[PDB]
Design a protein around this nucleic acid. Structure first.
Ligand SMILES: [K+]
Ligand SMILES: [Mg+2]
Ligand SMILES: [Mg+2]
Lengths: 85, 131, 97, 163, 66
RNA sequence: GGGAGACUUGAGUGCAGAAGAGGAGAGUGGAAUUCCAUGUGUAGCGGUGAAAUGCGUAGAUAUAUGGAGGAACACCAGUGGCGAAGGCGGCUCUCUGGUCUGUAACUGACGCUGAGGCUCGAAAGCGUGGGGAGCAAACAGGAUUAGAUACCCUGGUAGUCCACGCCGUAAACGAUGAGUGCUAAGUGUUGGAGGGUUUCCGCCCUUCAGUGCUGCAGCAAACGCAUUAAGCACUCCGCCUGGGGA
């Protein structure tokens, strides 16, 4: 949702202007992915939506790889905040 | 993407040459500037000019024709593809068409011709022939 | 966000105004019970139908403009109850901008 | 582009007996390919057809005279390597050293001996159809160039180009 | 041929299935919907008209047949 | 190439908009068939190249009023739309995905390809349980035929349908891998945006993303392709090395 995405940007971002950043993107994608996994458990047959789920997941994984390359401290802080492995 | 802007530059030149266009514009880099200057001062091009814009310096070319019809350039070809890069020694320097064309080489001295390379007794990476 | 829902439904032609008004108020009351705010309730027309929808070739149309969340089950409740009720012939819902 | 005032002499590549079919069996004609030249640079080829070998030869010669082209030479050699393509016939021709003679076994040998190229190294990569190999040959000899021409185009001098 | 849409000319929008006055002229006899190439509407408006007409049919405002 | 940086065009996020048989779940519909019931009415109906099997006097066909049940959605509907493909057309609602346009705020090369793996995947088919209107392999009978293990006809079982789990194949085809850039033009068309007019409508010009036709260069063995390339180029993956055996 737009209000939830606003909250997530304001929380995880470095500024109120820095809408775009890896931590911001990943924080949005994780909530979207949780909603989609619940939707999939409720709608097991919607493979057409599971595809977009996997695409979002790959996007998040690539962002996380960029973070592991550039800033390992930022990476670990992010993952402690989010709860990912 | 643009995994080979040098070859994109060469092919854009080739395409414009085949349609007999008069000029070109390209997102430039320093190696493109070197190649364009070499062509300028070797006779395959009439003129070349620069343009400075924030994202990337554009370079524009003004091609050459013996008449309205006849072409000075016939075709070009990159050898370092880059999937297989072509490094060569001062003896293995190519001789494009027995001296009627030119090979474009980068060496410790810089970006130069087969003339200068085979004279100085250096070699380097080959990046383009020109028939 | 709360989404606007036009709701038509077809009252039988030979019902009394008393029970009819209590019935419209019932459905509005149930929408409000499930949490869907009714902004307008109005009878559209009484008409000769295109065919015999419940045997009655004639009908009386009512419109119920509503604002509510999509998660609220107000529309589903109105739906099941109009199905069960044999007085109204059809209902129909329209998501509106 | 004129066969006039030239001592063109000819040579036949091949006569392919070639058939049309009719209700009354087969209408057998002879098709010939001939290459003619002056052994100075000027060479051409022609296709002829007729119910007679010499008639098709005459027609092909008369068509070859009307389609000449001039090849450059450098001490009985071509200036630079070239690849000629014409629809299935790839031929590469290299400038060879003097005294090495010709390296071909016809039709290319006929074309180049008539054009006057005494010393060359060639190879037919693709097909073997005499017509199209000869056509790729002339296409390559058309791709070829002259140092004076290229230097007048480029503006640079001849020595300034060859280095 | 260059033809005009009723909807575009009238500056009408948000087509309600209740609007029998506007939907019934896009209908031939026995309830069939006129083709776009007959009437001269846009694709967007034509599809909105299809949906509105089908709504009207199921709601008895218009007939499926006759 | 390695390392320390810096930038925004690429890639992506954000604002605002657009479209849509995009997908899954739920319910609802009118038409038509089949069956059942009620009347009318009575000798043929059906079917064929011919006939015949069949059904019908125990009331057929047909006709009119209802009811049950399943499946598919006339017009709109179009080399039109969406989707990675397969595929997806009644209607409404719940949840949800991708795409396009501007915007130039933000990150600042984060991208592409991608063996091996994972997922999806026409129809047939398999397992369990429902259901089964019509259609229909197998099968029966009538015919035809020299024969007819077929084409034709009358019937008709699995199956077609629903839920789950398996299968994982296709002329799964644009018989054209994905990505990027460059390269005459013409014309329609879908979704937008901007501008110059127009009382609005509308027309015009530009531009993006698709979707068709004609066609220059070039390519092609030819057929044909041609800004939706089969042209010029580059990166990666998959694949071929005569036919059969196989
Ligand atoms: K089954
Ligand atoms: Mg199946
Ligand atoms: Mg075409």
């Amino acid at each position: 949702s737009q209000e939830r995405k606003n909250e997530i940007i304001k929380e995880y971002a470095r500024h109120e202007g820095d809408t775009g950043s890896p931590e911001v993107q990943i924080a949005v994608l994780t909530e979207d992915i949780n909603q989609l996994n619940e939707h999939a458990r409720t709608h097991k047959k919607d493979h057409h939506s599971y595809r977009g789920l996997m695409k979002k997941i790959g996007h998040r994984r690539n962002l996380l790889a960029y973070l592991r390359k550039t800033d390992i401290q930022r990476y670990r802080e992010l993952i402690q905040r989010l709860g990912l492995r | 993407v643009m995994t080979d802007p040098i070859a994109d530059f060469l092919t854009r030149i080739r395409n414009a040459n085949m349609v007999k266009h008069e000029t070109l514009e390209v997102p430039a880099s320093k190696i493109k500037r070197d190649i364009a200057e070499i062509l300028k001062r070797e006779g395959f091009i009439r003129d070349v000019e620069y343009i400075e814009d924030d994202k990337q310096g554009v370079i524009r070319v003004f091609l050459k024709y013996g008449k309205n019809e006849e072409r000075v350039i016939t075709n070009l070809k990159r050898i370092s593809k880059p999937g297989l890069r072509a490094y060569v020694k001062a003896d293995e320097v190519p001789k494009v068409l027995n001296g009627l064309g030119i090979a474009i080489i980068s060496t410790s001295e810089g970006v130069i011709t087969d003339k200068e390379a085979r004279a100085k007794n250096i070699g380097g990476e080959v990046i383009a022939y020109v028939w | 966000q709360d989404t606007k829902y036009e709701i038509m439904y077809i009252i039988r032609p030979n019902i009394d105004e008393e029970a009819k008004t209590a019935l419209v108020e019932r459905f509005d009351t149930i929408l409000k019970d499930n949490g869907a705010e009714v902004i307008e309730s109005k009878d559209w027309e009484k008409r000769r139908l295109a065919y015999e929808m419940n045997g009655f070739r004639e009908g009386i149309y009512h419109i119920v403009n509503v604002t509510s969340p999509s998660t609220a089950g107000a529309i589903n409740e109105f739906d099941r109850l109009a199905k069960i009720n044999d007085d109204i012939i059809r209902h129909m819902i329209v998501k509106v901008e | 582009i004129d066969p006039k005032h030239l001592e063109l002499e000819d040579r036949v590549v091949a006569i392919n007996r070639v058939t049309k079919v009719v209700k009354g069996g087969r209408r057998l004609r002879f098709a010939a390919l001939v290459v003619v030249g002056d052994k100075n640079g000027h060479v051409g080829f022609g296709t002829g057809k007729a119910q007679e070998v010499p008639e098709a030869i005459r027609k092909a010669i008369e068509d070859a005279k009307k389609n000449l082209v001039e090849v450059p030479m450098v001490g009985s050699t071509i200036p630079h390597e070239v690849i000629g393509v014409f629809g299935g016939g790839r031929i590469l021709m290299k400038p060879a050293v003097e005294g090495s003679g010709v390296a071909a076994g016809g039709p290319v040998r006929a074309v180049l001996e008539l054009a006057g190229v005494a010393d060359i190294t060639s190879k037919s990569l693709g097909s073997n159809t005499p017509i199209n190999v000869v056509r790729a040959t002339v296409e390559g000899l058309k791709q070829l160039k002259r140092a004076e021409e290229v230097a007048a185009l480029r503006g640079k001098s001849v020595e300034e180009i060859i280095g | 041929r260059r033809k005009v849409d009723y909807i575009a000319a009238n500056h009408i929008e948000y087509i309600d299935y209740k609007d029998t006055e506007l939907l019934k002229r896009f209908i031939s006899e026995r309830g069939k919907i006129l083709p776009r190439r007959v009437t001269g509407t846009g694709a967007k408006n034509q599809r909105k008209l299809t949906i509105a007409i089908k709504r009207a049919r199921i709601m008895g405002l218009l007939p499926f047949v006759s």
